[PDB]
Amino acid sequence: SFFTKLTADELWKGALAETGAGAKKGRKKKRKDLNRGQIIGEGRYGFLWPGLNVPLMKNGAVQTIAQRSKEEQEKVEADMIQQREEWDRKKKMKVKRERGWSGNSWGGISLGPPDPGPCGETYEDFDTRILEVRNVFTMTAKEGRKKSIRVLVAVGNGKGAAGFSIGKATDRMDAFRKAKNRAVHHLHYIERYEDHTIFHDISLRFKRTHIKMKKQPKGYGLRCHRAIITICRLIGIKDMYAKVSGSINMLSLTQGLFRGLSRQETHQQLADKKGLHVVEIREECGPLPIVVASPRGPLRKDPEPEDEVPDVKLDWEDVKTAQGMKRSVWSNLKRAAT
Amino acid sequence: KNRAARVRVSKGDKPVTYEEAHAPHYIAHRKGWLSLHTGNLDGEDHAAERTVEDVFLRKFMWGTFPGCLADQLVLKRRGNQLEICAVVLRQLSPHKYYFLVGYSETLLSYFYKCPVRLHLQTVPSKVVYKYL
Amino acid sequence: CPICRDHKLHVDFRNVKLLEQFVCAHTGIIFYAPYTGVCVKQHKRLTQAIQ
Amino acid sequence: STDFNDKILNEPLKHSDFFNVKELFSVRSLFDARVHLGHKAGCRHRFMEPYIFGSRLDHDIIDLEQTATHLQLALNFTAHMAYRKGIILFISRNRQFSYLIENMARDCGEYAHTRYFRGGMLTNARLLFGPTVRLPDLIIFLHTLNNIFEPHVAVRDAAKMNIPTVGIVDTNCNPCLITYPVPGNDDSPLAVHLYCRLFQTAITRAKEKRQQVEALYRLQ
Amino acid sequence: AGSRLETVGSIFSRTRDLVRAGVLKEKPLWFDVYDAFPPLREPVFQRPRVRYGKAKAPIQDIW
RNA sequence: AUAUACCGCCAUCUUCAGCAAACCCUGAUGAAGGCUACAAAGUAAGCGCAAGUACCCACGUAAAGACGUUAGGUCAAGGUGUAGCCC
Ligand SMILES: [Mg+2]
Ligand SMILES: [Mg+2]
Ligand SMILES: [Mg+2]
Ligand SMILES: [Mg+2]
Ligand SMILES: [Mg+2]
Ligand SMILES: [Mg+2]
Ligand SMILES: [Mg+2]
Ligand SMILES: [Mg+2]
Ligand SMILES: [Zn+2]
């Protein structure tokens, strides 16, 4: 019956069945627009209607109703099927994504520059990296179990400026956008020694996470928790060691890392504070002293106390490694360039 | 929950025309009728025939101007003249619009034994009354 | 690996520009194979060429 | 443009007191206005101790010497901002002085927000007002506390948005985030009037000096 | 894109650091005035504490 | 056959008033939370309520009644995905 036929919109709605009790709580099909390749006036009889599917005027004479020969129509249908299958194949094929820390992990994956700001502000210089994606659920009074995405992202320009943010959203892409847009308004600035590492060893505890970061020479690489490697590449740090003890909570790790890297005393700050030259003694440069920083104000004439024995609170891991008693089958392994 | 001819709310990305935006209870209150004929007046006849003709005309025009109708047709009946006022899109070529206008007029006239006119009003894109 | 995927790259002792990429510019030590991903064969050829 | 900016914007930055704000007040004037009276010793805030001279019978006395120095700095900053044509916004939730502060703002040509500070006025400004709105270049708190003896949320929001804040901090206030704290009495009408008059005079002097310097430069 | 971390440094330090990094293309209007005539204390957020042991407020009664 | 794949039309709370995208803030940047009018962080487009409309008024009754709950009802209105029969 002609009168019982419906439209493509309604048919696809019913067939796909997106809305429904199943989709209510998750208790596949692809919408193909069948009108894409069709041409007005093209039917299985191969009629050539002047002005609809063929040129109206041919060499100055009004064309007339004609019909393609059977072989010509077969050729046309073959070409149509060829186009259909080419389109389907190009739809099915997918581009290989560049994985982050693992093939199926959102962590470490780039998100691109933060969205441009209103007042002529652009962050093309910044890169964004996902540090975590969670599916947090909250039981609501009416809508049973409610699914949401909490994303942690870190943005940075590779020149010290780096920040991080948490985005909440029902949709993963909205979460990404929220997080990476909020990050750029919460940028730290990290002082890098010689633009490749940190100014001194940093041992800190944020909540139950301990981060022990060691300043390292050029070319040492980033031997850090993978998330710390990502955040350091964003900040602009090339060379550093880092051990994460205690809880490895990603958010506490990120926040404590940023706190430590933001609360570090540069050599100029130390020289100004203690009114003395700060002298670097590199084993590669022999006994040559290298004044890295000098006080802006007057320099103390007092040579500072020479404490015979320091009172520093040493770390057993550092002491054991120095003494060579730490024989771990997992330390100093060979790993890809970081 | 009433579902009849209502475009349910969404995230605000769904464009809807004036007709779609209005539920059934707004007929004669905020929206008119898409087919005007004397079949449904008191003491008049052939309401069923007029309804069947209207349904067929709507399907035929939808299939004859595919992807061109920017809004529902308006079927007016005056005497035996049938006028189809159709809002369409400025995508198809005018040659094809004219070909199809002549074609539809002639075919419908011969099919329903009555003079049929087809008035096309073209718009750049579907007119959006609101975003649901 | 990086060397085997590009047949134009030749590990020859006169190709110092390529050989430098596998020596740390700051310490002068040839990177071990896992560092760059070069197979054992190409790493041995690189080490011989660098020497 | 280059020379104009060099001689207009950067010229006053070469002088310790370009606008001569020190003449606008003296320690005696502050004393007469009772700028030196704080709250009881029990209401004292830990960060206001450095500015408290002592405690006279459980009543704190604000060191008017430190007040004079801080007020010099705050008035100089305000004068320079007004000279540079920045937006100066006066914030105060003391309903006893809302009308006075609004009138002072209108007279001096600057802005005032003495009403309930809706959330996001500064942090959500682009959405609330418009994407091209211009936020205040300086915020002057005549009362850094809200009406429940908590710091005005505008203090935190101004610190967030990097808007320098001048602020009169009483002995029960928190000057940690106020860029230019002026330890003083923010509850006496005399003290509040003196603060309003000082800021009004400094801003008017700065604006008129800006006009005078512009005329001097453009006439030559 | 001024940093909104009012607990990390002062507005002056954050503005200066962002300008150095290049995040802020132009110095804000107040930066020159601040740098010329800074306050007696850099406004860095400090969390207040309550004295617990033998520590007492250094305020001395005016006699 | 499958309403436990659906469109379509609906029951139900609803004889409710809330659902809310996009932002901002708080919680040490955890799940999460966001109000005090002598106001103390919320602003909110949109939907709903309301308003407007029909009947006899501006009352009343209709109509309307969102987001969601019951894999609520209907494959037997029709269409339709999947599966199944074709002497
Ligand atoms: Mg895999
Ligand atoms: Mg009902
Ligand atoms: Mg007070
Ligand atoms: Mg059901
Ligand atoms: Mg009813
Ligand atoms: Mg109503
Ligand atoms: Mg059931
Ligand atoms: Mg049943
Ligand atoms: Zn190889």
Side-chain angles (χ1 to χ4, degrees):
Chain A
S1 175
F2 173 61
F3 292 106
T4 57
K5 301 170 175 292
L6 305 183
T7 56
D9 292 334
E10 293 159 297
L11 279 162
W12 280 119
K13 200 186 176 169
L16 300 177
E18 275 80 1
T19 49
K24 285 290 196 166
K25 317 175 188 163
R27 298 195 294 271
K28 290 182 180 180
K29 298 179 74 63
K30 288 275 198 175
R31 191 185 204 108
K32 190 190 177 178
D33 188 76
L34 307 193
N35 307 310
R36 189 178 54 69
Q38 296 204 64
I39 300 161
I40 295 189
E42 283 303 307
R44 64 178 286 181
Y45 290 167
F47 269 102
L48 306 170
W49 309 119
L52 194 72
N53 69 349
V54 296
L56 189 61
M57 300 300 299
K58 187 171 191 180
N59 298 115
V62 173
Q63 297 219 66
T64 63
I65 298 158
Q67 199 180 2
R68 271 184 289 240
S69 70
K70 185 172 183 291
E71 59 99 15
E72 290 175 354
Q73 187 59 16
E74 289 286 5
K75 174 183 177 189
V76 167
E77 300 309 329
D79 187 0
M80 186 63 200
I81 291 168
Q82 170 201 2
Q83 167 152 0
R84 179 217 73 204
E85 58 84 10
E86 286 165 359
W87 180 277
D88 186 75
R89 191 264 302 277
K90 193 167 184 293
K91 172 49 177 146
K92 293 291 186 183
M93 62 85 71
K94 60 217 165 188
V95 166
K96 308 202 180 183
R97 293 137 166 265
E98 180 178 339
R99 61 186 182 271
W101 304 327
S102 66
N104 203 67
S105 160
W106 274 109
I109 275 167
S110 187
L111 279 175
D115 293 352
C119 186
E121 294 161 352
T122 61
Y123 315 92
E124 72 284 18
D125 178 33
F126 278 67
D127 180 47
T128 307
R129 296 280 174 174
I130 301 165
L131 301 174
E132 184 177 2
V133 180
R134 273 274 194 81
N135 296 0
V136 292
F137 293 87
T138 195
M139 297 289 276
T140 64
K142 44 173 77 177
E143 295 171 4
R145 199 178 169 195
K146 181 180 183 174
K147 184 176 184 301
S148 172
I149 315 293
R150 184 185 71 183
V151 183
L152 181 59
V153 308
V155 302
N157 63 348
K159 303 187 292 299
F164 76 97
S165 187
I166 284 281
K168 299 291 290 297
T170 306
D171 166 49
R172 198 188 335 275
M173 295 301 129
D174 298 6
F176 291 164
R177 180 196 71 244
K178 289 176 197 191
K180 94 184 174 160
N181 290 343
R182 188 165 188 282
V184 290
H185 296 132
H186 298 72
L187 294 176
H188 299 256
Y189 181 81
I190 311 310
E191 305 285 12
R192 296 170 298 144
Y193 168 76
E194 293 282 54
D195 294 0
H196 71 92
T197 189
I198 57 173
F199 272 96
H200 52 77
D201 298 10
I202 302 166
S203 312
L204 66 92
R205 192 200 75 242
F206 190 83
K207 304 189 169 176
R208 290 288 94 195
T209 310
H210 304 76
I211 311 169
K212 175 66 177 76
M213 295 178 280
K214 290 186 188 167
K215 182 183 184 282
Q216 295 297 342
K218 276 195 177 177
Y220 182 83
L222 287 165
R223 289 187 46 186
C224 317
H225 189 285
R226 51 198 196 173
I228 300 178
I229 292 168
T230 296
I231 293 158
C232 289
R233 285 199 204 107
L234 290 169
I235 289 154
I237 288 164
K238 278 76 161 186
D239 295 324
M240 175 171 98
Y241 171 74
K243 179 75 183 72
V244 178
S245 301
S247 305
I248 315 295
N249 184 236
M250 192 63 70
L251 184 52
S252 286
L253 167 61
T254 315
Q255 207 165 350
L257 189 84
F258 270 114
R259 162 181 304 236
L261 294 174
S262 61
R263 294 182 191 179
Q264 71 187 311
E265 205 170 61
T266 70
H267 290 331
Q268 187 57 59
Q269 289 184 20
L270 181 67
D272 289 2
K273 175 182 69 163
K274 291 182 176 297
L276 293 169
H277 286 304
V278 178
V279 182
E280 184 177 295
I281 304 300
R282 282 174 172 214
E283 284 189 351
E284 77 207 284
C285 302
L288 181 78
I290 308 145
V291 178
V292 305
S294 313
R296 309 279 213 209
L299 188 137
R300 297 167 73 256
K301 301 294 116 186
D302 197 301
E304 199 181 18
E306 175 62 27
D307 183 2
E308 283 186 60
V309 185
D311 199 349
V312 67
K313 290 197 176 188
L314 295 169
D315 190 73
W316 175 230
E317 308 293 356
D318 305 359
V319 170
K320 198 162 40 167
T321 294
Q323 278 158 214
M325 283 147 71
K326 182 175 179 63
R327 315 162 201 71
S328 196
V329 307
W330 292 104
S331 290
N332 316 300
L333 280 179
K334 302 180 187 184
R335 297 174 185 249
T338 62
Chain B
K1 288 192 290 185
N2 304 327
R3 317 276 305 187
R6 294 162 170 77
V7 172
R8 314 297 274 167
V9 72
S10 178
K11 273 75 74 178
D13 69 296
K14 187 175 175 66
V16 300
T17 70
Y18 191 84
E19 298 291 315
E20 308 167 58
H22 283 84
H25 60 279
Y26 285 126
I27 290 155
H29 301 265
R30 287 174 203 212
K31 60 195 291 203
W33 292 283
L34 293 166
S35 68
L36 273 179
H37 55 98
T38 64
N40 281 319
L41 296 154
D42 183 77
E44 297 295 328
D45 290 334
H46 310 315
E49 280 90 354
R50 296 302 93 70
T51 311
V52 169
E53 298 159 356
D54 292 7
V55 169
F56 171 85
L57 284 162
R58 284 179 196 294
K59 282 188 179 66
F60 171 94
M61 284 296 288
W62 186 262
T64 301
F65 291 78
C68 287
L69 303 186
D71 200 358
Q72 301 278 304
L73 304 161
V74 180
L75 303 172
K76 292 157 173 310
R77 277 183 186 81
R78 269 203 314 290
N80 79 334
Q81 308 171 245
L82 175 81
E83 293 78 0
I84 311 179
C85 315
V87 184
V88 293
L89 291 168
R90 298 175 178 175
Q91 291 177 358
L92 195 61
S93 58
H95 278 104
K96 294 167 192 208
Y97 274 122
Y98 272 87
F99 175 103
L100 288 172
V101 166
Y103 171 75
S104 301
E105 276 165 3
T106 297
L107 195 70
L108 297 173
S109 308
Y110 276 68
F111 187 68
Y112 282 137
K113 315 301 176 191
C114 82
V116 181
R117 290 212 309 278
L118 171 51
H119 298 109
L120 297 184
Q121 186 192 135
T122 71
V123 287
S125 45
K126 186 171 74 64
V127 185
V128 176
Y129 173 60
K130 71 198 312 198
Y131 274 102
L132 295 190
Chain C
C1 82
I3 298 292
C4 287
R5 72 184 174 184
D6 198 3
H7 68 97
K8 283 175 195 73
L9 292 173
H10 295 296
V11 182
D12 178 50
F13 77 106
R14 293 163 291 145
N15 196 358
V16 295
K17 297 294 181 185
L18 175 62
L19 300 181
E20 284 172 45
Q21 298 182 13
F22 299 89
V23 179
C24 192
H26 315 289
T27 54
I29 66 182
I30 311 181
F31 298 133
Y32 47 70
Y35 191 91
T36 51
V38 291
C39 46
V40 175
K41 176 183 164 45
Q42 286 312 302
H43 182 244
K44 290 179 180 162
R45 294 186 62 243
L46 279 160
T47 299
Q48 290 166 7
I50 281 157
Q51 187 53 52
Chain D
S1 178
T2 49
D3 183 14
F4 163 87
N5 289 58
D6 179 74
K7 198 184 69 58
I8 301 293
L9 279 295
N10 291 102
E11 168 71 348
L13 302 183
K14 304 295 184 70
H15 304 286
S16 68
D17 196 1
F18 176 76
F19 302 97
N20 198 18
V21 298
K22 65 182 77 173
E23 299 297 341
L24 292 186
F25 71 90
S26 53
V27 175
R28 166 55 73 174
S29 61
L30 310 178
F31 199 87
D32 295 358
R34 310 170 201 164
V35 168
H36 64 289
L37 312 181
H39 289 83
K40 298 288 286 295
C43 298
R44 194 198 300 133
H45 196 275
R46 202 206 169 105
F47 298 148
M48 284 300 303
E49 284 160 4
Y51 318 122
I52 281 160
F53 179 66
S55 187
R56 174 62 182 181
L57 276 284
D58 276 335
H59 283 89
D60 293 357
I61 299 297
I62 295 152
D63 191 0
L64 284 186
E65 304 303 335
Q66 307 198 65
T67 292
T69 59
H70 287 75
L71 182 55
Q72 175 98 19
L73 278 166
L75 283 173
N76 184 51
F77 193 79
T78 303
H80 278 292
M81 296 309 298
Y83 173 96
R84 302 159 82 73
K85 293 171 156 103
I87 288 168
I88 306 175
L89 177 58
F90 296 86
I91 289 181
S92 170
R93 290 291 294 125
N94 206 354
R95 304 168 69 240
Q96 177 171 12
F97 309 108
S98 173
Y99 187 78
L100 180 64
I101 288 163
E102 290 175 352
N103 269 282
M104 177 256 293
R106 199 184 54 234
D107 304 354
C108 74
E110 301 300 347
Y111 310 80
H113 190 321
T114 64
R115 313 295 176 161
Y116 170 75
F117 202 78
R118 277 195 295 140
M121 287 286 107
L122 296 163
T123 53
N124 212 11
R126 294 191 183 293
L127 178 139
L128 296 167
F129 292 113
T132 57
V133 65
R134 187 179 160 196
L135 287 170
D137 289 272
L138 170 64
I139 286 164
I140 305 188
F141 283 96
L142 277 296
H143 305 78
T144 60
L145 289 182
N146 62 15
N147 292 120
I148 62 150
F149 316 101
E150 302 274 16
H152 207 286
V153 65
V155 182
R156 187 205 69 207
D157 288 0
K160 282 179 168 293
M161 303 300 289
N162 297 114
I163 295 158
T165 58
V166 166
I168 313 311
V169 288
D170 218 348
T171 63
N172 69 338
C173 297
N174 187 339
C176 79
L177 276 181
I178 290 157
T179 315
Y180 290 91
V182 176
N185 171 17
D186 54 26
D187 286 324
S188 294
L190 280 179
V192 174
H193 283 57
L194 178 54
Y195 302 140
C196 281
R197 156 165 62 260
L198 287 165
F199 286 122
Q200 181 166 19
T201 297
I203 285 164
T204 294
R205 275 183 168 189
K207 289 195 193 182
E208 74 184 7
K209 186 70 169 184
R210 171 62 184 266
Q211 291 301 339
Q212 288 176 16
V213 177
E214 273 190 305
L216 187 148
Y217 170 60
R218 298 305 195 182
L219 290 172
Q220 293 190 341
Chain E
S3 176
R4 294 195 189 183
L5 302 172
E6 74 283 6
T7 55
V8 181
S10 73
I11 54 150
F12 174 61
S13 81
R14 301 205 298 281
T15 303
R16 182 186 58 206
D17 295 9
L18 289 198
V19 162
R20 166 164 50 193
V23 182
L24 297 183
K25 300 297 186 292
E26 56 86 27
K27 295 191 286 292
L29 184 73
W30 56 267
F31 197 86
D32 288 322
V33 190
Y34 186 114
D35 195 1
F37 318 105
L40 291 155
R41 159 170 183 288
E42 174 170 271
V44 186
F45 169 84
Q46 290 180 2
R47 187 192 64 80
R49 297 166 188 276
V50 303
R51 294 197 185 75
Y52 272 111
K54 305 179 179 173
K56 292 181 183 292
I59 308 311
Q60 293 307 113
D61 304 5
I62 288 151
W63 295 124

mmCIF file of all heavy atoms in Angstrom, chain D residues 53-75:
data_model
loop_
_atom_site.group_PDB
_atom_site.id
_atom_site.type_symbol
_atom_site.label_atom_id
_atom_site.label_comp_id
_atom_site.label_asym_id
_atom_site.label_seq_id
_atom_site.Cartn_x
_atom_site.Cartn_y
_atom_site.Cartn_z
ATOM 1 N N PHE D 53 49.570 48.927 67.524
ATOM 2 C CA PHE D 53 50.510 49.543 68.453
ATOM 3 C C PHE D 53 50.493 48.844 69.803
ATOM 4 O O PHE D 53 51.545 48.618 70.409
ATOM 5 C CB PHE D 53 50.167 51.021 68.610
ATOM 6 C CG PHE D 53 51.061 51.759 69.557
ATOM 7 C CD1 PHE D 53 52.394 51.950 69.265
ATOM 8 C CD2 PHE D 53 50.558 52.282 70.731
ATOM 9 C CE1 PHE D 53 53.210 52.637 70.133
ATOM 10 C CE2 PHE D 53 51.370 52.969 71.598
ATOM 11 C CZ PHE D 53 52.697 53.147 71.298
ATOM 12 N N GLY D 54 49.311 48.500 70.291
ATOM 13 C CA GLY D 54 49.203 47.874 71.589
ATOM 14 C C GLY D 54 47.764 47.541 71.893
ATOM 15 O O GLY D 54 46.957 47.335 70.987
ATOM 16 N N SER D 55 47.446 47.486 73.182
ATOM 17 C CA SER D 55 46.094 47.190 73.639
ATOM 18 C C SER D 55 45.803 48.056 74.854
ATOM 19 O O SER D 55 46.329 47.800 75.940
ATOM 20 C CB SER D 55 45.938 45.710 73.975
ATOM 21 O OG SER D 55 44.591 45.396 74.272
ATOM 22 N N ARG D 56 44.963 49.066 74.681
ATOM 23 C CA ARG D 56 44.611 49.988 75.756
ATOM 24 C C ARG D 56 43.321 49.499 76.401
ATOM 25 O O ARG D 56 42.226 49.777 75.908
ATOM 26 C CB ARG D 56 44.464 51.405 75.219
ATOM 27 C CG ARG D 56 43.964 52.408 76.235
ATOM 28 C CD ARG D 56 44.923 52.538 77.398
ATOM 29 N NE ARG D 56 44.436 53.469 78.405
ATOM 30 C CZ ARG D 56 45.097 53.781 79.509
ATOM 31 N NH1 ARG D 56 46.279 53.256 79.778
ATOM 32 N NH2 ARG D 56 44.557 54.640 80.366
ATOM 33 N N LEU D 57 43.450 48.776 77.510
ATOM 34 C CA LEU D 57 42.295 48.251 78.234
ATOM 35 C C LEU D 57 41.468 47.330 77.340
ATOM 36 O O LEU D 57 40.260 47.504 77.173
ATOM 37 C CB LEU D 57 41.435 49.388 78.792
ATOM 38 C CG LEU D 57 41.853 49.987 80.137
ATOM 39 C CD1 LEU D 57 41.478 49.060 81.272
ATOM 40 C CD2 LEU D 57 43.336 50.283 80.162
ATOM 41 N N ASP D 58 42.135 46.335 76.760
ATOM 42 C CA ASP D 58 41.541 45.333 75.881
ATOM 43 C C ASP D 58 41.048 45.918 74.567
ATOM 44 O O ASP D 58 40.309 45.246 73.841
ATOM 45 C CB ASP D 58 40.385 44.593 76.565
ATOM 46 C CG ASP D 58 40.857 43.432 77.422
ATOM 47 O OD1 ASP D 58 41.946 42.883 77.151
ATOM 48 O OD2 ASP D 58 40.131 43.066 78.371
ATOM 49 N N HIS D 59 41.432 47.147 74.238
ATOM 50 C CA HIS D 59 41.074 47.784 72.977
ATOM 51 C C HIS D 59 42.344 48.023 72.182
ATOM 52 O O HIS D 59 43.275 48.666 72.677
ATOM 53 C CB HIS D 59 40.341 49.101 73.215
ATOM 54 C CG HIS D 59 38.912 48.927 73.610
ATOM 55 N ND1 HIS D 59 38.516 48.794 74.921
ATOM 56 C CD2 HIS D 59 37.785 48.857 72.867
ATOM 57 C CE1 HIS D 59 37.205 48.651 74.969
ATOM 58 N NE2 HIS D 59 36.737 48.687 73.736
ATOM 59 N N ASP D 60 42.379 47.518 70.955
ATOM 60 C CA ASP D 60 43.591 47.593 70.157
ATOM 61 C C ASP D 60 43.812 49.002 69.626
ATOM 62 O O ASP D 60 42.863 49.716 69.290
ATOM 63 C CB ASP D 60 43.517 46.603 69.004
ATOM 64 C CG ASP D 60 43.546 45.168 69.473
ATOM 65 O OD1 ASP D 60 43.676 44.948 70.693
ATOM 66 O OD2 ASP D 60 43.447 44.259 68.625
ATOM 67 N N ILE D 61 45.075 49.398 69.542
ATOM 68 C CA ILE D 61 45.457 50.702 69.020
ATOM 69 C C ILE D 61 46.352 50.477 67.814
ATOM 70 O O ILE D 61 47.420 49.865 67.928
ATOM 71 C CB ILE D 61 46.164 51.560 70.078
ATOM 72 C CG1 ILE D 61 45.236 51.800 71.269
ATOM 73 C CG2 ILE D 61 46.610 52.867 69.476
ATOM 74 C CD1 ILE D 61 43.982 52.573 70.940
ATOM 75 N N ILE D 62 45.917 50.977 66.668
ATOM 76 C CA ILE D 62 46.611 50.755 65.408
ATOM 77 C C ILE D 62 47.749 51.754 65.292
ATOM 78 O O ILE D 62 47.563 52.955 65.518
ATOM 79 C CB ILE D 62 45.637 50.881 64.229
ATOM 80 C CG1 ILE D 62 44.589 49.772 64.286
ATOM 81 C CG2 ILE D 62 46.379 50.819 62.923
ATOM 82 C CD1 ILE D 62 43.287 50.154 63.662
ATOM 83 N N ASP D 63 48.928 51.264 64.932
ATOM 84 C CA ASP D 63 50.109 52.113 64.846
ATOM 85 C C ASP D 63 49.930 53.106 63.709
ATOM 86 O O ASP D 63 50.046 52.746 62.532
ATOM 87 C CB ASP D 63 51.350 51.255 64.637
ATOM 88 C CG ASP D 63 52.629 52.039 64.796
ATOM 89 O OD1 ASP D 63 52.550 53.254 65.067
ATOM 90 O OD2 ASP D 63 53.716 51.441 64.653
ATOM 91 N N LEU D 64 49.656 54.362 64.053
ATOM 92 C CA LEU D 64 49.401 55.354 63.021
ATOM 93 C C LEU D 64 50.646 55.692 62.219
ATOM 94 O O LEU D 64 50.520 56.234 61.123
ATOM 95 C CB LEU D 64 48.817 56.627 63.624
ATOM 96 C CG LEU D 64 47.342 56.560 64.016
ATOM 97 C CD1 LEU D 64 46.859 57.925 64.451
ATOM 98 C CD2 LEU D 64 46.488 56.047 62.877
ATOM 99 N N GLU D 65 51.838 55.357 62.703
ATOM 100 C CA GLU D 65 53.023 55.521 61.867
ATOM 101 C C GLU D 65 52.988 54.557 60.687
ATOM 102 O O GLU D 65 53.177 54.956 59.526
ATOM 103 C CB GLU D 65 54.278 55.307 62.709
ATOM 104 C CG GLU D 65 54.367 56.217 63.922
ATOM 105 C CD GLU D 65 54.293 57.690 63.561
ATOM 106 O OE1 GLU D 65 54.648 58.044 62.417
ATOM 107 O OE2 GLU D 65 53.886 58.497 64.422
ATOM 108 N N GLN D 66 52.731 53.280 60.966
ATOM 109 C CA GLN D 66 52.558 52.316 59.889
ATOM 110 C C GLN D 66 51.363 52.682 59.027
ATOM 111 O O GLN D 66 51.393 52.502 57.806
ATOM 112 C CB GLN D 66 52.391 50.911 60.459
ATOM 113 C CG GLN D 66 53.485 50.503 61.411
ATOM 114 C CD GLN D 66 53.544 49.010 61.605
ATOM 115 O OE1 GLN D 66 53.841 48.264 60.675
ATOM 116 N NE2 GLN D 66 53.259 48.562 62.818
ATOM 117 N N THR D 67 50.296 53.189 59.644
ATOM 118 C CA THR D 67 49.151 53.625 58.856
ATOM 119 C C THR D 67 49.538 54.744 57.907
ATOM 120 O O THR D 67 49.091 54.769 56.762
ATOM 121 C CB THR D 67 48.014 54.078 59.764
ATOM 122 O OG1 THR D 67 47.480 52.949 60.464
ATOM 123 C CG2 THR D 67 46.915 54.728 58.954
ATOM 124 N N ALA D 68 50.361 55.687 58.364
ATOM 125 C CA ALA D 68 50.776 56.788 57.507
ATOM 126 C C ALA D 68 51.601 56.285 56.333
ATOM 127 O O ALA D 68 51.382 56.691 55.189
ATOM 128 C CB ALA D 68 51.565 57.811 58.319
ATOM 129 N N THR D 69 52.548 55.385 56.593
ATOM 130 C CA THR D 69 53.347 54.846 55.492
ATOM 131 C C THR D 69 52.471 54.087 54.497
ATOM 132 O O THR D 69 52.548 54.301 53.276
ATOM 133 C CB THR D 69 54.443 53.936 56.039
ATOM 134 O OG1 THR D 69 53.854 52.864 56.778
ATOM 135 C CG2 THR D 69 55.378 54.716 56.942
ATOM 136 N N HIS D 70 51.622 53.196 55.005
ATOM 137 C CA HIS D 70 50.774 52.396 54.135
ATOM 138 C C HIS D 70 49.801 53.265 53.363
ATOM 139 O O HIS D 70 49.516 53.002 52.192
ATOM 140 C CB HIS D 70 50.024 51.363 54.966
ATOM 141 C CG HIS D 70 50.885 50.242 55.449
ATOM 142 N ND1 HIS D 70 51.789 50.388 56.475
ATOM 143 C CD2 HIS D 70 50.985 48.957 55.042
ATOM 144 C CE1 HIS D 70 52.407 49.242 56.682
ATOM 145 N NE2 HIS D 70 51.938 48.356 55.824
ATOM 146 N N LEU D 71 49.265 54.297 54.008
ATOM 147 C CA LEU D 71 48.333 55.200 53.351
ATOM 148 C C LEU D 71 49.033 56.013 52.281
ATOM 149 O O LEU D 71 48.459 56.276 51.221
ATOM 150 C CB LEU D 71 47.690 56.108 54.393
ATOM 151 C CG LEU D 71 46.639 57.106 53.929
ATOM 152 C CD1 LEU D 71 45.518 56.424 53.179
ATOM 153 C CD2 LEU D 71 46.098 57.835 55.135
ATOM 154 N N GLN D 72 50.277 56.416 52.531
ATOM 155 C CA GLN D 72 51.060 57.058 51.486
ATOM 156 C C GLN D 72 51.154 56.155 50.270
ATOM 157 O O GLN D 72 50.882 56.578 49.141
ATOM 158 C CB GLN D 72 52.454 57.388 52.014
ATOM 159 C CG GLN D 72 53.414 57.954 50.980
ATOM 160 C CD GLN D 72 53.492 59.456 51.030
ATOM 161 O OE1 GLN D 72 53.121 60.075 52.025
ATOM 162 N NE2 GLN D 72 53.979 60.057 49.952
ATOM 163 N N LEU D 73 51.536 54.897 50.483
ATOM 164 C CA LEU D 73 51.687 53.987 49.352
ATOM 165 C C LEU D 73 50.362 53.772 48.630
ATOM 166 O O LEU D 73 50.307 53.792 47.395
ATOM 167 C CB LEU D 73 52.254 52.654 49.827
ATOM 168 C CG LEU D 73 53.766 52.623 50.011
ATOM 169 C CD1 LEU D 73 54.168 51.397 50.797
ATOM 170 C CD2 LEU D 73 54.465 52.656 48.669
ATOM 171 N N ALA D 74 49.284 53.558 49.383
ATOM 172 C CA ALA D 74 47.990 53.296 48.768
ATOM 173 C C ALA D 74 47.495 54.498 47.982
ATOM 174 O O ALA D 74 46.987 54.352 46.865
ATOM 175 C CB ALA D 74 46.975 52.909 49.838
ATOM 176 N N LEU D 75 47.632 55.698 48.544
ATOM 177 C CA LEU D 75 47.196 56.894 47.840
ATOM 178 C C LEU D 75 48.038 57.138 46.601
ATOM 179 O O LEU D 75 47.513 57.551 45.565
ATOM 180 C CB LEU D 75 47.252 58.102 48.768
ATOM 181 C CG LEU D 75 46.114 58.222 49.780
ATOM 182 C CD1 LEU D 75 46.386 59.358 50.733
ATOM 183 C CD2 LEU D 75 44.791 58.419 49.087
#
